[PDB]
Structures are given as structure tokens and as C-alpha cells.
């Protein structure tokens, strides 16, 4: 059994009294709902309020979300209830506290009295000429325009970041990682940090654009998109590696599918169309995160159909990740909990088997491990598709789950 929970949204830093402090009162509900891991925001000093422009990595007290004591307290609370903590690791780029003699912000400060992470432009990818001094290696991946991109091929860089990551585990209690903007460096580099820090899991955010048509809708065939994702996992170490990826393929298809196009939910081989259908053990599914949803809303799930999104990922192969707002703010708390309960009770895991029973525009029906049947869609009556022995146990707007 494994169910993730993103424990913050894009407005969290703003929480009166501190975000971690407020999360303490949510721990028991999260644990009781069957969550096994909670993904927490980037914990260090950041030039940006949300934490995605990290500077003094060791300076946890400067975080807008709360300080080290407050963070350790939350992680300890989660651990007391048997839930693990995943930290949002932002290492593609970094902001330097000080300017060099060129007036460029490229002299770093790790946040400790000694020289840990006190880098210079020599650690900035040479091709990021907005900040580099031309001496470093070429960036192993994509660039982040608003800040210096780090040269992960630099030995001191690899050594000091691994040192830092191990301190997050030993000093704050983090168990695992969420690799922010993993397209920014190669899978080979991600392997260095993953293999060198032994996380219970390392879920990478590898976000590639999805193929779409002239009408704006994603193509039915998204094999190229999930292929990129499995190729990343292969390169990071495959089955032996703790690394895995967010299933953006499933997110994109699902966004469009629920709009009366549920025939999109099966590929020509009879399998789920996203990463879930090719390497479920490595696919972390989700309805929305702080980027696609929340106040950023870069690619929100159709608002009136969110529970169909959860009826899908919570009963299916892959590792589902519940979004904070959906659980505590949309009034779906009991319904989501019931779905997680059905998943756990029937022993459904990331590798459970999926047998699709119906895949028409307004009706998708699937059977998992021969023990659960789920339906989503605007077509009310699918009773002729339900196998004998199955009784309904959860249901709401345009979705229903049976157990037999
Ligand atoms: C203040 C910056 O705001 C913008 O960048 C944001 C971005 O819009 C957010 O979506 C967020 O992106 C992160 C995702 O949330 C996360 O899931 C993913 O894993 O990682 C990305 C980051 O790679 O956060 C970023 C960074 O805060 C905007 O695009 C950016 O230009 C802007 N930076 C400006 C402000 C500065 C402040 O000192 C300058 O240093 C920058 O040069 C300037 O452009
Ligand atoms: C048990 C059913 O659960 C789901 O149906 C929802 C439906 O989508 C909602 O729109 C809502 O409809 C009710 C209206 O709110 C109400 O005003 C109206 O008077 O009555 C309707 C009917 O209840 O609520 C229902 C219930 O949550 C799901 O989408 C739907 O497919 C499902 N029906 C299945 C259950 C059965 C038992 O094995 C069979 O009776 C059906 O054939 C089967 O499809
Ligand atoms: C479990 C494997 O997942 C990945 O493999 C997928 C391929 O990348 C993808 O191209 C392939 O496409 C085929 C489809 O299966 C068919 O539906 C289609 O009709 O024909 C396509 C022809 O290629 O689908 C693969 C998934 O079925 C990884 O690339 C691969 O390395 C993975 N195997 C790993 C992991 C396990 C399972 O834990 C080990 O037992 C394997 O030995 C190891 O190699
Ligand atoms: Ca220092
Ligand atoms: Ca850059
Ligand atoms: Ca980069």
C-alpha cells in the first residue's frame, strides 16, 4: 500500500502563523485517510516566497513556510502516525547571495559558518552566460532562465549537495525526495544524487509538452510522451533505482478524457494510455498539483469533474498522489478517504492488474485485480457491464465503485 499526498498549494507560504504549524492539526486526518507519504515544499531560504529559487540551502529558518524546529515537529508528527516525509528538492538552479567584482550575483552562501556550498561562478554551467565565468562544464539539461543553473558534473557540487541531502534526512527527518524540474539536468546526474542518498523514493518532475491537434486537444496517441518518461526511469537505473516519475501523460489524457471523451482511456493494446500502462510501479498519478491547479492553474482538471479524477487514480495501478486542496478544501474529504479505504482493503498496489470493461465517450468501466470495479462518466446506467458478485460501495457525481 502506497498513497502520496501533496501537503501544500501555491498560497501556503502565506499561512497566518506558519504553514507547518497549521499542518500539525491536519496530520491525524491525513494518516487516518490512508496516506503513506506527504510531499512538503522546498524547505530552505529562497529568493522567491514559494521556495523555488533556493539560495542558502542550509538556512531552513529563513523559510516562509516555517523554521527548522517547526519543520522537525511536523515530520516527527507524521512519523508518529507512520507517514513518511518527502522533501521538494530544487537543485537545477540556485541563487547566489552576493555579487562578484563583475556585479553579477554568482558568489554563493550555503548558510553555515564554514564553506559548505559557498560556491562561485565556477559552479555555474558555462553556457548560462547570464551568470557564468565560462570555466564550468556544459549544463547536462535544460536551463532555468531566472537564476544560475548549477554544474552537476562539478565534483565539489556533487559532493556538497549529497552531503546536504543526507543532512535533510539526518537532521530534519526527511525520508524521500521530489526532484523539481528534473528536465534541468540529465537522468545520469539524478542517479548520482538518488544512489548517493538512499531515499525511500525519488519522484521526478519531468515535464515535457504534450502533442496536441489543431483543436487544442491532446492527440489520442501519446506513446511518445510516456516513452520519454520510461526512458528517463531506464536511464536513472530502472527497477533497482528508487527513482520514479509523475505521470504527466495520464494527467494530460485524463484532463481531456472526462469531457465526454472517455474512449481516450485505453490504448490500442488494451492498456492504460499513460505511464501507468507501461511501468505502473514507476508512475505517480495525480489530478492536479500546485502548478496545474491552485492559484497558478496552468492546466487545471475540469473543476466539476474532480471526483472522477480521484475515482480513477485511487482505484488504479500506479502510485496515486492526492492534492491538498481537493482533500481539505473542496468538500471531498470523506469521499477521497472512502476511495483510499477501498484501495487499501482490497490490497491494490502500484502493480495491480487492470482489465478495462468499457471505454465509450461517456462511460469508462474497469476492473482491478478482479476485486474492484470502477466507473466514471455521465452515462448513468452501466449495470449490464458489472460482473456478477459485485456490490456498489462508493459513489458520487458521475462515478461509482463496486467490491465483490
Ligand atoms: C519570481 C519568478 O517567478 C516565475 O518563476 C516561478 C514559476 O512561475 C513558478 O511556476 C515556480 O516554478 C517551479 C514550479 O512551481 C515547480 O513545481 C517546478 O518543479 O520548478 C519550477 C521552477 O523551476 O517558481 C518559479 C521560480 O520562483 C518567473 O518565471 C520568473 O521569471 C521569476 N523570476 C524573476 C524574479 C527574480 C527575483 O530575485 C529574479 O532573480 C529573476 O531573474 C526574475 O526573472
Ligand atoms: C450508483 C450510481 O452512482 C453514480 O450516480 C450518481 C449520479 O452520477 C449523480 O448525477 C446523482 O444522480 C441522482 C440525482 O442527484 C437525483 O436528483 C436523481 O433523482 O437521482 C439520481 C440517481 O441517484 O447521484 C448518483 C448516485 O451517486 C454513478 O454515476 C452511476 O453510474 C451509479 N449507477 C450504477 C449503480 C448500480 C448497481 O450495481 C445500478 O443501479 C446502475 O445501473 C449502475 O450504473
Ligand atoms: C517494465 C518495462 O517498462 C518499459 O518498457 C516499455 C517500453 O519502453 C515501451 O516502448 C514498450 O512498448 C511496447 C508495449 O509494451 C506494447 O503495448 C506495444 O504494443 O508494443 C511496444 C513495443 O515496444 O512498452 C514497455 C512496457 O511494456 C521500460 O523501458 C523497461 O525497461 C521496463 N522493464 C524493466 C523493469 C522490470 C519490471 O520491474 C524488469 O522485470 C524488466 O526486466 C526490466 O527490463
Ligand atoms: Ca558559508
Ligand atoms: Ca539559468
Ligand atoms: Ca540545468
Q: Is 327 helix (H, G, I), strand (E, B) or coil?
A: helix
Q: Which ligand is nearest to the CA of 383?
A: 2
Which residue's C-alpha comes closest to atom 15 of ligand 3? 278
State how far the Cα of 79 lies from the Cα of 135, in Å rounded to an integer. Answer: 44
State which ligand 2 atom lies nearest to the alpha carbon of 379: 31
Ligand 6 ion local residues (Cβ < 5 A): 92, 139, 141, 149, 184
Q: State if residue 389 touches ligand 2 by the CB under 6 angstroms criterion.
A: no
In the reported structure, the alpha carbon of residue 184 is separated from the centroid of ligand 5 by a whole-number distance in angstroms of 9
Pocket of ligand 3 (CB under 6 A): 227, 230, 234, 238-239, 269, 271, 278-279, 281
* Count of C-beta atoms within a 10 Å radius of residue 269: 8
Asked if 274 contacts 222 with a C-beta cutoff of 8 angstroms, the reply is yes
Ligand 5 ion local residues (Cβ < 5 A): 128, 143-144, 149
Q: Which ligand is nearest to the CA of 53?
A: 1
Q: DSSP string covering 18-36, please?
A: -HHHHHHTTHHHHHHTT--
The residues, any chain, with a CB within 8 Å of residue 25's CB and separated by 6 or more, are: none
Q: What domains does the chain contain, in order, with CATH numbers?
A: 2-347 (3.20.20.80), 348-404 (2.60.40.1180)
State which ligand 3 atom lies nearest to the alpha carbon of 278: 26
State how far the Cα of 286 lies from the Cα of 382, in Å rounded to an integer. Answer: 26
Give me the residues paired with residue 364 across strands: 359, 376
Triad 89, 93, 97: Cα angle to 5°: 105
State how far the Cα of 188 lies from the Cα of 127, in Å rounded to an integer. Answer: 19
Pocket of ligand 1 (CB under 6 A): 47-48, 50, 52-53, 144, 146-147, 180-181, 205, 290-291, 296
In the reported structure, the alpha carbon of residue 231 is separated from the centroid of ligand 3 by a whole-number distance in angstroms of 10
State which ligand 3 atom lies nearest to the alpha carbon of 268: 19
Element (H, E) at 399: strand 399-403
In the reported structure, the alpha carbon of residue 161 is separated from the centroid of ligand 6 by a whole-number distance in angstroms of 15
State how far the Cα of 402 lies from the Cα of 399, in Å rounded to an integer. Answer: 10
Q: How far separated are the first and last CA of the chain, in Å rounded?
A: 20
Resolution in angstrom units: 2.0
Asked if 179 contacts 197 with a C-beta cutoff of 8 angstroms, the reply is no
State which ligand 1 atom lies nearest to the alpha carbon of 289: 17
For residue 356, the number of C-alpha atoms closer than 13 Å in the C-beta half-sphere is 21
For residue 144, the number of C-alpha atoms closer than 13 Å in the C-beta half-sphere is 22
State how far the Cα of 284 lies from the Cα of 19, in Å rounded to an integer. Answer: 25
In the reported structure, the alpha carbon of residue 310 is separated from the centroid of ligand 2 by a whole-number distance in angstroms of 17
> Strand order of the sheet with strand 354-360?
354-360, 363-368, 372-376, 399-403, 391-396
The residues, any chain, with a CB within 8 Å of residue 309's CB and separated by 6 or more, are: 254, 258, 287, 288, 301
Amino acid at each position: 500500500h502506497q498513497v502520496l499526498f501533496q501537503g501544500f498549494n501555491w498560497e501556503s507560504w502565506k499561512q497566518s502563523g506558519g504553514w507547518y504549524n497549521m499542518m500539525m492539526g491536519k496530520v491525524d486526518d491525513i494518516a487516518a485517510a490512508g496516506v503513506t507519504h506527504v510531499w512538503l515544499p522546498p524547505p530552505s531560504h529562497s529568493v522567491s516566497n514559494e521556495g523555488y529559487m533556493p539560495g542558502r540551502l542550509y538556512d531552513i529558518d529563513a523559510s516562509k513556510y516555517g523554521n527548522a524546529a517547526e519543520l522537525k515537529s511536523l515530520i516527527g508528527a507524521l512519523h508518529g502516525k507512520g507517514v513518511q516525509a518527502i522533501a521538494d528538492i530544487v537543485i537545477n538552479h540556485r541563487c547566489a547571495d552576493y555579487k562578484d567584482s563583475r556585479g553579477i550575483y554568482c558568489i554563493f552562501e550555503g548558510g553555515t559558518s564554514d564553506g559548505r556550498l559557498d560556491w562561485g561562478p565556477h559552479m555555474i554551467c558555462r553556457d548560462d552566460t547570464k551568470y557564468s565565468d565560462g570555466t564550468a562544464n556544459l549544463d547536462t539539461g535544460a536551463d532555468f532562465a531566472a537564476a544560475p543553473d548549477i554544474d552537476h558534473l562539478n565534483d565539489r557540487v556533487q559532493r556538497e549537495l549529497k552531503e546536504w541531502l543526507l543532512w535533510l534526512k539526518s537532521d530534519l527527518g526527511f525520508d524521500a525526495w521530489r526532484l523539481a524540474f528534473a528536465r534541468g539536468y540529465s537522468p545520469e546526474m539524478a542517479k548520482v544524487y538518488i544512489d548517493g542518498t538512499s531515499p525511500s523514493l525519488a519522484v521526478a518532475e519531468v515535464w515535457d509538452n504534450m502533442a496536441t491537434g489543431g483543436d487544442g486537444k491532446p492527440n489520442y496517441d501519446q506513446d511518445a510522451h510516456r516513452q520519454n518518461l520510461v526512458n528517463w526511469v531506464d536511464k536513472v537505473g530502472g527497477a533497482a533505482s528508487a527513482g520514479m516519475v509523475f505521470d504527466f501523460t495520464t494527467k494530460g489524457i485524463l484532463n481531456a478524457a472526462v469531457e465526454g471523451e472517455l474512449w481516450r482511456l485505453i490504448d490500442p493494446q488494451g492498456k492504460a494510455p499513460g505511464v501507468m500502462g507501461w511501468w505502473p510501479a514507476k508512475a505517480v498519478t495525480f489530478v492536479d498539483n500546485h502548478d496545474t491547479g491552485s492559484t497558478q492553474a496552468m492546466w487545471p482538471f475540469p473543476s466539476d469533474k474532480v471526483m472522477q479524477g480521484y475515482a480513477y487514480i485511487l482505484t488504479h495501478p500506479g502510485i496515486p498522489c492526492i492534492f491538498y486542496d481537493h482533500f481539505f478544501n473542496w468538500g471531498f474529504k470523506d469521499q477521497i478517504a472512502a476511495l483510499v479505504a477501498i484501495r487499501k482493503r482490497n490490497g491494490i498496489t502500484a502493480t495491480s492488474a487492470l482489465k478495462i470493461l468499457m471505454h465509450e465517450g461517456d462511460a469508462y468501466v474497469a476492473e482491478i485485480d478482479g476485486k474492484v470495479v470502477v466507473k466514471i462518466g455521465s452515462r448513468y446506467d452501466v449495470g449490464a457491464v458489472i460482473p456478477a458478485g459485485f456490490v456498489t460501495s462508493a459513489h458520487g457525481n458521475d462515478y461509482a465503485v463496486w467490491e465483490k
